[PDB]
Scaffold this active site. Structure first.
Site, PDB file in Angstrom:
ATOM      1  N   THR A 108       0.705  -1.325   0.000  1.00 14.98           N
ATOM      2  CA  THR A 108       0.000   0.000   0.000  1.00 14.98           C
ATOM      3  C   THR A 108       0.719   1.352   0.000  1.00 14.98           C
ATOM      4  O   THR A 108       1.733   1.543   0.663  1.00 14.98           O
ATOM      5  CB  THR A 108      -0.912  -0.068   1.231  1.00 14.98           C
ATOM      6  OG1 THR A 108      -1.652  -1.299   1.138  1.00 14.98           O
ATOM      7  CG2 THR A 108      -1.938   1.061   1.297  1.00 14.98           C
TER       8      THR A 108
HETATM    9  C1  LIG Z   1       0.167  -2.697   0.280  1.00 19.02           C
HETATM   10  C2  LIG Z   1      -0.445  -3.314  -1.021  1.00 19.02           C
HETATM   11  C3  LIG Z   1       1.293  -3.656   0.671  1.00 19.02           C
HETATM   12  O1  LIG Z   1       1.132  -3.971   2.057  1.00 19.02           O
HETATM   13  C4  LIG Z   1      -0.959  -2.539   1.414  1.00 19.02           C
HETATM   14  O2  LIG Z   1      -0.345  -2.427   2.702  1.00 19.02           O
HETATM   15  C5  LIG Z   1      -2.088  -3.604   1.449  1.00 19.02           C
HETATM   16  C6  LIG Z   1      -3.235  -3.021   2.275  1.00 19.02           C
HETATM   17  C7  LIG Z   1      -4.525  -3.492   1.905  1.00 19.02           C
HETATM   18  C8  LIG Z   1      -4.793  -4.528   0.998  1.00 19.02           C
HETATM   19  C9  LIG Z   1      -6.106  -4.915   0.720  1.00 19.02           C
HETATM   20  C10 LIG Z   1      -7.177  -4.280   1.344  1.00 19.02           C
HETATM   21  C11 LIG Z   1      -6.930  -3.252   2.249  1.00 19.02           C
HETATM   22  C12 LIG Z   1      -5.618  -2.870   2.523  1.00 19.02           C
HETATM   23  N1  LIG Z   1      -1.664  -4.850   2.107  1.00 19.02           N
HETATM   24  C13 LIG Z   1      -1.696  -6.045   1.487  1.00 19.02           C
HETATM   25  O3  LIG Z   1      -2.021  -6.224   0.311  1.00 19.02           O
HETATM   26  C14 LIG Z   1      -1.284  -7.227   2.362  1.00 19.02           C
HETATM   27  C15 LIG Z   1       0.218  -7.258   2.488  1.00 19.02           C
HETATM   28  C16 LIG Z   1       0.524  -7.689   3.789  1.00 19.02           C
HETATM   29  C17 LIG Z   1       0.459  -9.049   4.093  1.00 19.02           C
HETATM   30  C18 LIG Z   1       0.774  -9.500   5.371  1.00 19.02           C
HETATM   31  C19 LIG Z   1       1.150  -8.599   6.368  1.00 19.02           C
HETATM   32  O4  LIG Z   1       1.473  -9.021   7.631  1.00 19.02           O
HETATM   33  C20 LIG Z   1       0.541  -9.914   8.273  1.00 19.02           C
HETATM   34  C21 LIG Z   1       1.226  -7.243   6.065  1.00 19.02           C
HETATM   35  C22 LIG Z   1       0.916  -6.788   4.783  1.00 19.02           C
HETATM   36  N2  LIG Z   1      -1.727  -8.470   1.696  1.00 19.02           N
HETATM   37  C23 LIG Z   1      -2.514  -9.382   2.300  1.00 19.02           C
HETATM   38  O5  LIG Z   1      -2.967  -9.278   3.442  1.00 19.02           O
HETATM   39  C24 LIG Z   1      -2.849 -10.612   1.454  1.00 19.02           C
HETATM   40  C25 LIG Z   1      -4.339 -10.574   1.094  1.00 19.02           C
HETATM   41  N3  LIG Z   1      -2.564 -11.835   2.226  1.00 19.02           N
HETATM   42  C26 LIG Z   1      -1.334 -12.376   2.309  1.00 19.02           C
HETATM   43  O6  LIG Z   1      -0.335 -11.906   1.764  1.00 19.02           O
HETATM   44  C27 LIG Z   1      -1.239 -13.653   3.172  1.00 19.02           C
HETATM   45  N4  LIG Z   1      -0.434 -13.275   4.333  1.00 19.02           N
HETATM   46  C28 LIG Z   1      -1.261 -13.415   5.551  1.00 19.02           C
HETATM   47  C29 LIG Z   1      -0.537 -12.913   6.743  1.00 19.02           C
HETATM   48  O7  LIG Z   1       0.695 -13.680   6.821  1.00 19.02           O
HETATM   49  C30 LIG Z   1       1.535 -13.594   5.632  1.00 19.02           C
HETATM   50  C31 LIG Z   1       0.788 -14.109   4.440  1.00 19.02           C
END
Ligand SMILES: *[C@@](C)(CO)[C@](*)(O)[C@H](Cc1ccccc1)NC(=O)[C@H](Cc1ccc(OC)cc1)NC(=O)[C@H](C)NC(=O)CN1CCOCC1
Ligand SMILES: *[C@@](C)(CO)[C@](*)(O)[C@H](Cc1ccccc1)NC(=O)[C@H](Cc1ccc(OC)cc1)NC(=O)[C@H](C)NC(=O)CN1CCOCC1
Ligand SMILES: *[C@@](C)(CO)[C@](*)(O)[C@H](Cc1ccccc1)NC(=O)[C@H](Cc1ccc(OC)cc1)NC(=O)[C@H](C)NC(=O)CN1CCOCC1
Ligand SMILES: *[C@@](C)(CO)[C@](*)(O)[C@H](Cc1ccccc1)NC(=O)[C@H](Cc1ccc(OC)cc1)NC(=O)[C@H](C)NC(=O)CN1CCOCC1
Ligand SMILES: [Mg+2]
Ligand SMILES: [Mg+2]
Ligand SMILES: [Mg+2]
Lengths: 196, 204, 222, 212, 222, 195, 225, 196, 195
Positions: free
Chosen positions: A1
């Site tokens: 993000t």
């Molecule tokens: C940007 C894209 C990168 O972080 C944003 O922060 C974004 C915020 C967002 C996304 C969708 C809806 C609302 C807000 N975050 C993500 O896309 C996020 C990245 C992330 C993953 C894990 C984190 O620590 C737990 C922190 C940031 N992506 C996800 O949550 C995706 C859907 N799931 C995964 O990657 C699976 N994760 C689960 C947690 O453990 C690691 C694997």
């Protein structure tokens, strides 16, 4: 993000990209990171998609129950509920939330809540992985009491740069305008913002 | 110290023309040491047969548990449990222990007494139902059993022919696994007769 | 797995392959990955097989009770809300990755849920190990204002991409079409492009081939 | 593996199984675990197949070079020590070998040397080596006398491998027998456990644990 | 940390007749859950009526085949164009493999041809050079599926003469090249059904005194 | 702990159990009886983790004795073995499992048959003609496979047992200070004093 | 033992009736930071070969120097350096494949995935892959990284086997490649919009296209979500 | 560190802060991160102080020996020597170096060499921990063929922001101007740049 | 390996060394001689890592024998012990050190005195009236502290040694299968066959 919220003369505007990632794979390129917790209190979500969603849902529930009993909550109140959840569950959460709302007494307000669950009231806030790349730009360009069109350009140019450098950011630039007039949703596509 | 391969063992089930077969080896060991050559892994509750591979203490425990549950079922329902129903009971019971599971590979076999349809089913240690027209395999020589069954099997075999196919599937699979063998038992199941045969196999 | 979901004119369609794996071994060559939560809300599930089945049945059970309680047809957002709060509570330990779709009094809907409890909205979605192969096809051929027969074609083509290119996917294509104002039509084995060729030989053994030590009649009666 | 070799009145008996494993996967049931170095020397193999097979064949080449250079067949002691000094050079590198160098010479008489991959070298009358060594010991020790006949000694060696083949999951296949005399080694056949077990069970009346 | 090894999947199979030998292998090449090639041959004619395959990690496999092919070349140069016998090839390959005992070639190696009496020969190796001549050997990802089928159909294991009370075994006999190819094709179709890394195409190299012949067959591509 | 053996013959069950109790580099005792009488015709030997062994044995003993007093009746060896197995089967998924392996030798007075059950700490039960726990089995099983016959007398069983102890004393690394031998038959439990 | 620092993402390619096409974007990523935008990851060797490289860029630049040096060395004492004894695609590949495997065997790899696309002297299409492990393979379509997962499925719909190659024109092939590049820009988080594309044809020769852009993108549906 | 080099009409200018840290302790607040490898070829040093020093000393030696035999080396040549050292010793080095020089044929040139030892020729380069915060600003503000005074302001404003956000950066802003006229050293103190 | 003892009395040095060679759960041999004669009046016992022990002992033996042939003279026990210590002192900082502990019993013919040296694998040398390596010392040292006198005869030394072996056989966990005893005095080295 990459997310940001910016107060201005008529109220406040929230801004966000639309990229969601699972590693270097883009799971969703049209995400909506700007969410409604109340009629004119919104938040920008960064960090874990699951954590921020679960928090926003609980906050929306709390403010709905607040409204049923005590009427419209202040933006400060909404930020306090976010803080309470983020601070007390700091060990199990990865959520960087910016809270932004419009009162008629207080006008536009922005609160940022980082990982630890601390609260910081600011004129404008930036957050998310892509925010690092625009601290320099935003500090140099932000002015208090901007117009709607100026603030929209400030957010558009800022997020355009964040998106350009951050691989974890991209897609469209969504915005939400909070004023006395009401709520306005804006969208800006790559073909416009990329060549700014 | 991998719970599913301390004791060893295998179970296989097949469907034929108006019949089903379920077979198992007899070995119970402690890693390299063979301990018992009488340890049967197939049990039955009425006309529904259940084979269980994996950690032997759990094999014993689950048998006792499903005897317990099917006895109460029969008392309340006033009828014998059917294979499709029992399959669901096994799945529920295993998933109940989702984060502390029984280390087992159960296999249900039988003929529905109402419809006359042959039925077989398999499960993982955590309760996922694996239904099949042809065959189900389980145990330490499951790879071998998969290979044997996939090549040897053909649909609509007669009970006497199905016996030969399932037996040859088990025997040749067991002989390629260190932890399986030491004797074998085959159950041929028809609508209202069941024949149990002990196979002669190499004892190493 | 490979699973997809595609929105169209008057509803939504979901599809899935029919392979189940244990490491490199194909456990089930024709399993059903399309699950019924309610009559007109269906789920496609990838991840831990027992978890997808168990979580889909539990929420399906609670949805039926809710439908009976409220005297209303269930909504997709209710299933979505219940699934996501259940999955979030378990912090990803329940490895269910679902594409939730259906029609209800509010309209037609398409969502996805991840094991940790995050949800997405879209016109086209894909999950599972063959989701990248499927999404490549969806990104290439999808358009706004699809017809029913176009969406089915697009969905099954996206599943086929997984079947051929992903080792975790194979065998057949299941489809379910949920159209507004109509009954949902589950199309089990809608495509079967992986039929086993005739074997070169019959391995039927001469009777007596297997050496036997003992025989005995087993008593199944009381 | 289970391999044994024991000394007695009539020379040396050597008996081995024929199984090869990779974890719980039975890789082979027909492996040769005795290598014939010369008409008077035998080597048994237990442990890593490649390690054993490679270095014992190499040992055979060294023994041949000895008799070319010295115009005399190598002693069992010297042959075993070539192998033991070799593996000692690799000590710590991860070679896995349990071997027995059996043979007859004039100066020594019938002789057996145990040689393993951590550099142990032992002269002795009885040894069992391999994952099933203990099972072989149990039968062999409890029936061993120095005064066994050639016929009885051959059977005991065969019966001891069978015992281990049965109980040890990582032993089996078939039994290979050898008899070493003053005149050299004599092969006494390959005996499939598939038939041998039932034959022994019936004739001997043993293996009552098994369903007959 | 850098991992120098990988797994390219596939499976191979060698059978020996009275006056011939076959070495078969599927043409699929994979990494993880992706297909790299549907037709990448790994069974090679190395000269002197020796066919070879080194299945597992393809980089090591190709390296070994390349070194052995080169070994055959230099054997001719150094020993007056003498034909390298299959038993001598086997021993030579052991030294190639064992030369890297402490950083092994990650491959199951099989070679086939004719011995010096004109009879069919198959030799098989472990990753570090232990070898053994056999009538029969399957190697690679689906070796555990195919090998027990070969024990039963080539060496007639567990098969007794009908009516003899399990006392008389089914007698061993050589199979015709027609019969052997039937078993190879059935082995690989069965392996393709139940193993994800096996499929796409089957290439068989048949070795008689007249030379090396090839046959190709399609396999399922899912 | 360490060595516990059991042999079922025609008319009796014979249990042999090592006398040594070692801790560190010291043999603290050479006359330890690793057995408890559960009922007049049921004996249980045990081996495993220090403290756990006796604590478990005596806990089972108390329960079987309680049953006997309540019903004025002796549980069959099969029933006692099933009770013991279930206790171990519970234990293995506790916070701290009992690390105890047992052999149960009993004479069923209703069947007039000796019975030997081998149960490990996981709760893995098997009825056997002869049984062993720990490293002992690696020698004794093959030995008994050869020399055991199902119709042997108690005297023949003792000679068969002497053969096992001799083999263990020859090939086992540790000094286990001999065994205490006990016989379970139709007349109950008695100890052989000269072994 | 290494870890890659500045990296390049997917390289995609396919055969068509008269030759081969290969493409790769112009990005040099520094972890999540999209650091460098003027990076050329397709390197032509002569007028009959293009080497496309993904992975570590410092190692890519090393490989550039090696190929550059190979051209120089081949010209030495070679009157037919621009004729019969010119560098073939198959020679260039085998050289790189040797180097890659030798470096992995010394536990110090060149952290790259490489696709060598070209046309042989007899007119045959050459397309073969090699990576840091020394693993080599050939197929009618080849791709690295995310391209393997997303481009290959799309390109295989055009050329699914050998017999489809004569039936495929350069227009159809290039269209598929350009479409695949767009899909990668939607879905790969370390991809850029700008890319280079090369066509090696047995009749028209080497055509190197620079500064191409992904276009005709669908984003409008985002406003409804 | 925060460092940058910027080409302009008359040549090139290098810029750097003056902070050296050992954890959160400032070991030296008046550091000179702009070092001379040749008369008109200079480099900005970021990463390990010891590594970058040892590299710069070796390069200065190589270019001195080059000059003795072949005359003035090109800026490209200097960057190639830096690369060779950084690339071949990548496992044992933590050095991010920007090379900047003035030829009369080629005018101003900037080469950046990141951790891996790759070489990148650019119109301008930024590096060091504090560079992250000014990617947005610098991309938006940089123009080709700027004047001396414009480039000085561009660097001053950029490093001012980098210093403001990065804790690992601070002290004075040193600059070195490379033109046909010669070499000019500039210094700018906190009291000036902080209030920009 | 495991148990090696040494006692210096009035006119001789007596070395006792266990006969067992154990590997895993099998006693492979019960008649192993853990000693080498370095010279006519110098004996070395050894214990430690498998392979290393014999390889080291024979290497030292070869060197002392080489010296004897070169100079036509027998090195004093003190000189031999110093040579052995230095070899171990080198070894400990090698790529793969010899893990061998030794006792050197010798009779100095020039001094007409018995001498016992204890040297561990680190190269730690001490001259002692009585010595032991490994866990044996934990029992024998205190025992000998009590019963040892410096003026004892060879017979008294053997009885003192019997007392040590008895204590070890009582309290040691492992069966070491008795000891081979050897006496070093003015007439050279001889083995006691009945111990
Ligand atoms: C940007 C894209 C990168 O972080 C944003 O922060 C974004 C915020 C967002 C996304 C969708 C809806 C609302 C807000 N975050 C993500 O896309 C996020 C990245 C992330 C993953 C894990 C984190 O620590 C737990 C922190 C940031 N992506 C996800 O949550 C995706 C859907 N799931 C995964 O990657 C699976 N994760 C689960 C947690 O453990 C690691 C694997
Ligand atoms: C594709 C086939 C995965 O490659 C799909 O995701 C598929 C979905 C599915 C859903 C319903 C019914 C069938 C199939 N998933 C599987 O087939 C799944 C693969 C998988 C297993 C475990 C995982 O870790 C969380 C991830 C993916 N297969 C199973 O769950 C099988 C039926 N069961 C087992 O493998 C049980 N094993 C688990 C390991 O412990 C031993 C027993
Ligand atoms: C019995 C069967 C127990 O293994 C025997 O010891 C047997 C002995 C033997 C000797 C010569 C010819 C055939 C059989 N040993 C094996 O079959 C052996 C078991 C073993 C595996 C791995 C080892 O390394 C610690 C040591 C012993 N099996 C093999 O060697 C198999 C065929 N090959 C491999 O496991 C390949 N490994 C070897 C070590 O390097 C990595 C690859
Ligand atoms: C900013 C201040 C933060 O990195 C710059 O990069 C600066 C560059 C510089 C400093 C002085 C002269 C020229 C250029 N770097 C440092 O100040 C540097 C920080 C750093 C330390 C270690 C690194 O990895 C090895 C990378 C960066 N500080 C130092 O080198 C100081 C003098 N020494 C230490 O901190 C001791 N280090 C030695 C290496 O191992 C960790 C402890
Ligand atoms: Mg066995
Ligand atoms: Mg596929
Ligand atoms: Mg600062």
């Amino acid at each position: 993000t990459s997310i940001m919220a910016v107060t201005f003369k008529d109220g406040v505007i929230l801004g966000a990209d639309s990229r969601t990632t699972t590693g270097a794979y883009i799971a969703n390129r049209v995400t909506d990171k700007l969410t409604r917790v109340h009629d004119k209190i919104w938040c920008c979500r960064s960090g874990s998609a699951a954590d921020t969603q679960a928090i926003a849902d609980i906050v929306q529930y709390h403010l709905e129950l607040y409204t049923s009993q005590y009427g419209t909550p202040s933006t400060e109140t909404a930020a306090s509920v976010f803080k309470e959840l983020c601070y007390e569950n700091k060990d199990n959460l990865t959520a960087g939330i910016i809270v932004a709302g419009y009162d008629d007494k207080n006008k536009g307000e922005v609160y940022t809540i980082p990982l630890g669950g601390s609260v910081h009231k600011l004129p404008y806030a930036i957050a998310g992985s892509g925010s690092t790349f625009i601290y320099g730009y935003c500090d140099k360009n932000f002015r208090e009491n901007m117009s709607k069109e100026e603030t929209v350009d400030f957010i558009k140019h800022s997020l355009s740069q964040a998106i350009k450098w951050d691989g974890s950011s991209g897609g469209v630039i969504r915005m939400v305008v909070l004023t006395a007039a009401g709520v306005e949703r804006l969208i800006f596509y790559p073909d416009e913002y990329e060549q700014l | 110290s991998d719970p599913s391969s301390i004791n060893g063992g295998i179970v296989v089930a097949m469907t034929g023309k108006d019949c089903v077969a379920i077979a198992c080896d007899l070995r119970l060991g402690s890693q390299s040491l063979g301990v018992s050559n009488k340890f049967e892994k197939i049990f039955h509750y009425g006309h529904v047969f259940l084979g269980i591979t994996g950690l032997a203490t759990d094999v014993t425990t689950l048998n006792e548990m499903f005897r317990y549950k099917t006895n109460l079922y029969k008392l309340k329902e006033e009828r014998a449990i059917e294979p499709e129903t029992f399959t669901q009971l096994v799945s529920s019971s295993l998933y109940e222990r989702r984060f502390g599971p029984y280390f087992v590979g159960p296999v249900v076999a039988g003929i529905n007494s109402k419809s006359g349809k042959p039925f077989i089913a398999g499960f993982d240690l955590i309760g996922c139902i694996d239904e099949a027209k042809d065959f189900i395999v389980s145990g330490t020589a499951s790879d071998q059993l998969f290979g044997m069954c996939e090549s040897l099997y053909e649909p609509n075999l007669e009970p006497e022919d199905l016996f030969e196919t399932i037996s040859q599937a088990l025997l040749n699979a067991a002989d390629r696994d260190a932890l399986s063998g030491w004797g074998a038992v085959v159950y041929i199941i028809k609508k209202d007769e069941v024949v149990k045969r002990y196979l002669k196999m190499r004892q190493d | 797995t490979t699973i997809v979901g595609v929105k169209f004119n008057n509803g939504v369609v979901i599809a899935a392959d029919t392979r189940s794996t244990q490491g490199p071994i194909v456990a089930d060559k024709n399993c059903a990955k399309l699950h019924r939560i309610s009559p007109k809300i269906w789920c496609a599930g990838a991840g831990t097989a027992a978890d997808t089945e168990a979580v889909t049945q539990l929420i399906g059970s609670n949805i039926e009770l809710h439908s009976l309680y409220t005297s209303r047809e269930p909504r997709v957002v209710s299933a979505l809300q219940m699934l996501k709060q259940h999955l979030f509570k378990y912090q990803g330990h329940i490895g269910a990755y679902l594409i939730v779709a259906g029609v209800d009094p509010t309209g037609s809907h398409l969502f996805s849920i991840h094991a940790h409890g995050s949800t997405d909205v879209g016109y086209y979605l894909s999950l599972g190990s063959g989701s990248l192969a499927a999404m490549a096809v969806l990104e290439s051929h999808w358009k706004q204002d699809l017809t029913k027969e176009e969406a089915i074609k697009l969905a099954s083509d996206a599943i086929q991409a997984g079947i051929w290119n992903d080792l975790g996917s194979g065998s057949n294509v299941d489809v379910c079409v949920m159209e507004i104002g109509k009954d949902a039509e589950y199309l089990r084995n809608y495509l079967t492009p992986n039929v086993r060729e005739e074997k070169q030989k019959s391995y039927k053994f001469p009777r007596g081939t297997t050496a036997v030590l003992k025989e005995s009649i087993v008593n199944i009666c009381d | 593996t289970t391999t044994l070799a024991f000394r007695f009145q009539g020379g040396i008996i050597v008996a081995v199984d024929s199984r090869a494993t990779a974890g719980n996967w039975v890789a082979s049931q027909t492996v040769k675990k005795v290598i014939e170095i010369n008409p008077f020397l035998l080597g048994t193999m237990a442990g890593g197949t490649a390690d054993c097979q490679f270095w014992e064949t190499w040992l055979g080449s060294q023994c041949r070079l000895h008799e070319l250079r010295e115009k005399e067949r190598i002693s069992v002691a010297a042959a075993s020590k070539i192998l033991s000094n070799l593996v000692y050079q690799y000590k710590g590198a991860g070679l896995s070998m349990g071997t027995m160098i059996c043979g007859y010479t004039r100066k020594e008489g019938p002789t057996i040397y145990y040689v393993d991959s951590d550099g142990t070298r032992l002269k002795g009358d009885i040894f069992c080596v391999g994952s099933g060594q203990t099972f072989a010991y149990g039968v062999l020790d409890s029936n061993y006398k120095w005064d066994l006949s050639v016929e009885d000694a051959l059977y005991l060696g065969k019966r001891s491998i069978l015992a281990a083949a049965h109980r040890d999951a990582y032993s089996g296949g078939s039994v290979n027998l050898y008899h070493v005399t003053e005149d050299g080694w004599i092969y006494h056949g390959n005996h499939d456990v598939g038939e041998l077990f039932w034959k022994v069970k019936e004739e001997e009346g043993s293996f009552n644990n098994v369903i007959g | 940390q850098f991992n120098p090894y990988g797994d390219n999947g596939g499976t191979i199979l060698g059978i020996a007749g009275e006056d011939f030998a076959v070495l078969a292998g599927d043409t699929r090449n994979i990494t993880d859950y992706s297909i790299n090639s549907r037709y990448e041959p790994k069974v090679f004619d190395c000269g002197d009526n020796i066919v070879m395959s080194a299945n597992g990690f393809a980089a090591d496999g190709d390296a070994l085949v390349k070194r052995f092919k080169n070994s055959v070349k230099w054997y001719h140069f150094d020993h007056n164009d003498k034909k390298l016998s299959i038993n001598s090839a086997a021993r030579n390959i052991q030294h190639l493999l064992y030369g890297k005992r402490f950083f092994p070639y990650y491959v199951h190696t099989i070679i086939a041809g004719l011995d010096e009496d004109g009879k069919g020969a198959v030799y098989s190796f472990d990753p570090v050079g232990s070898y053994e001549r056999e009538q029969c050997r399957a190697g690679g990802a689906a070796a555990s599926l195919i090998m027990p089928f070969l024990d039963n159909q080539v060496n007639f294991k567990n098969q007794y003469e009908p009516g003899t009370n399990g006392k008389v075994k089914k007698p061993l006999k050589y199979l015709s090249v027609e019969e052997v190819i039937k078993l190879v094709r059935d082995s690989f179709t069965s392996a393709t059904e139940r193993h994800i890394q096996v499929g796409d195409g089957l290439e068989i190299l048949i070795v008689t005194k007249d030379g090396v012949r090839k046959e190709f067959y399609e396999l399922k591509r899912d | 702990m360490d060595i516990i053996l059991g042999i079922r013959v025609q008319d009796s069950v014979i249990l042999a159990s090592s006398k040594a109790v070692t801790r560190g580099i010291s043999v603290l005792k050479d006359s330890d009886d690793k057995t408890r009488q559960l009922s007049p015709h049921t004996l249980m030997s045990f081996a495993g983790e220090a403290g756990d062994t006796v604590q478990f044995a005596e806990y089972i003993q108390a329960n079987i004795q309680l049953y006997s007093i309540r019903e004025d009746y002796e549980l069959s060896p099969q029933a006692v073995s099933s009770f013991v197995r279930q206790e171990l089967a519970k234990s293995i998924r506790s916070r701290r499992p009992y690390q105890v392996n047992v052999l149960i030798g009993g004479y069923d007075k209703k069947k007039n048959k000796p019975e030997l059950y081998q149960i490990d700490y996981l709760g893995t039960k098997v009825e056997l003609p002869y049984g062993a726990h720990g490293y002992s089995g690696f020698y004794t099983f093959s030995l008994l496979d050869h020399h055991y016959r199902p119709d042997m007398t108690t005297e023949e069983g003792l000679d068969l047992l002497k053969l096992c102890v001799q083999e263990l004393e020859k090939r086992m690394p540790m000094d286990f200070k001999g065994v205490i031998v006990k016989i379970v038959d139709k007349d109950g439990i008695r100890q052989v004093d000269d072994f | 033992t290494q870890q890659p620092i500045v990296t390049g993402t997917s390289v995609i390619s396919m055969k068509y009736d008269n030759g081969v096409i290969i493409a790769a974007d112009n990005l040099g990523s520094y972890g999540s930071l999209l650091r460098f935008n003027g990076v050329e990851r397709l390197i032509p060797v002569g007028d009959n070969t293009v080497v496309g490289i993904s992975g570590d860029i410092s190692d890519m630049q090393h490989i550039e120097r090696l190929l550059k040096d190979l051209v120089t060395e081949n010209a030495y004492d070679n009157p037919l350096a621009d004729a019969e004894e010119a560098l073939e695609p198959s020679y260039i590949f085998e050289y790189l494949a040797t180097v890659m495997y030798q470096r992995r065997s010394k536990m110090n790899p060149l952290w790259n995935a490489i696709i060598v696309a070209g046309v042989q002297s007899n007119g045959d299409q050459f397309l073969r892959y090699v990576n840091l492990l020394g693993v080599t393979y050939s197929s009618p379509t080849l791709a690295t990284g995310f391209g393997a997962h997303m481009a290959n499925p799309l390109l295989r719909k055009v050329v699914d086997r050998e017999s489809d190659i004569p039936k495929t024109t350069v227009q159809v092939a290039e269209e598929a490649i350009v479409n695949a590049m767009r899909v990668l820009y939607y879905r790969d988080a370390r991809s850029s919009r700008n890319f280079s594309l090369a066509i090696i044809d047995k009749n028209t020769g080497l055509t190197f296209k620079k500064n191409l852009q992904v276009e005709n993108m669908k984003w409008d549906f985002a406003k409804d979500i």
